[model samples]
Target: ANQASVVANQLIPINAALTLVMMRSEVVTPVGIPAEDIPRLVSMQVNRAVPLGTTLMPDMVKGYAA
Candidate 1:
């Protein structure tokens, strides 16, 4: 067995829809960023919306109802 000091950190996504939970999540403070950061944020949003072609086929389906 190996022993060492351990530290853990967690980050929850702030984009979740529920406001109560989002408020509790710690967000990184903006440092010296300008209002123009909005454009970059919008671009990231759009990238998430675009499909990356991830999918599962019929063979993996576990239901006979189809």
Candidate 2:
């Protein structure tokens, strides 16, 4: 007999500034941050591309297929 496995996925936005906030706030998802910090974090801008489905890692942000 043969068996198959299935996995569900979701698309999320990841960028340098967003990464910084996540690291500083000690959270993975965006909702973890406090309301007060939202403005400061949002105001900071960065020029980068973090494609959807890319997993956030300690050293770098890479795509899942990587």
Candidate 3:
């Protein structure tokens, strides 16, 4: 009854353990990570344990021009 989320610090892929679905927020206004951002965030690694249904924001990942 929840969307796919991160369980550990790992690299992301289209067919990885994490595949985001178009799910609405539970207690928020706008969607933090839009559809366009989906492509940018992929093939990266998340740095924390994100709960189920939680929005995968940019800060959660390692980064781009670091």
Candidate 4:
């Protein structure tokens, strides 16, 4: 039924409709700053996308850590 379809979609490894380039300092800027600063900038940007009520997920932290 509807539940089965939803579960199947969740299990599927579908290709992205659009590939986004999430830039880091090394790519975006010529010179790199401290990691601490990077998080501050990311927090600022993310706050814009999702406000105070929304949680900053672990995956977000892991992505920028790379």
Give the winner by TM-score: 3
For model 3, residues 1-66, the per-residue Cα lDDT tens digits are: 333332323334333333444223343333344434554555665666565556656566666332
- Over 1-66, each residue of candidate 2 has an lDDT whose tens digit, in order, gives 122111112232334445233322222342322323433443333334434433333233232121
C-alpha-based local distance difference test score of model 4 = 0.25
The TM-score between candidate 3 and the true structure equals 0.46
What is the per-residue lDDT of model 1 for residues 1-66, given as tens digits with 9 covering 90 to 100?
232211112222323221121112112232221222322322121111112221211221122112
Pairs that clash in candidate 1: none
Among the numbered candidates, top lDDT falls to: 3
Q: Which ranges in model 1 have alpha carbons more than 4 Å from their true place?
A: 1-13, 16-32, 43-66
lDDT of each: 0.21, 0.31, 0.46, 0.25
- For each candidate in turn, the TM-score is 0.18, 0.23, 0.46, 0.19
Clash totals in order: 0, 0, 0, 0
Greater TM-score among 1 and 2 belongs to 2
Tens digit per residue, CA lDDT, model 4, 1-66: 111100011111222221112222222222233322433433222212322222233233323343
Give the candidates in order of TM-score, highest first.
3, 2, 4, 1
Candidate 2: give the clashing pairs.
none
Pick the winner on TM-score between candidates 1 and 4: 4
Q: What range of 10 consecutive residues in model 1 has the weakest lDDT sum?
A: 43-52
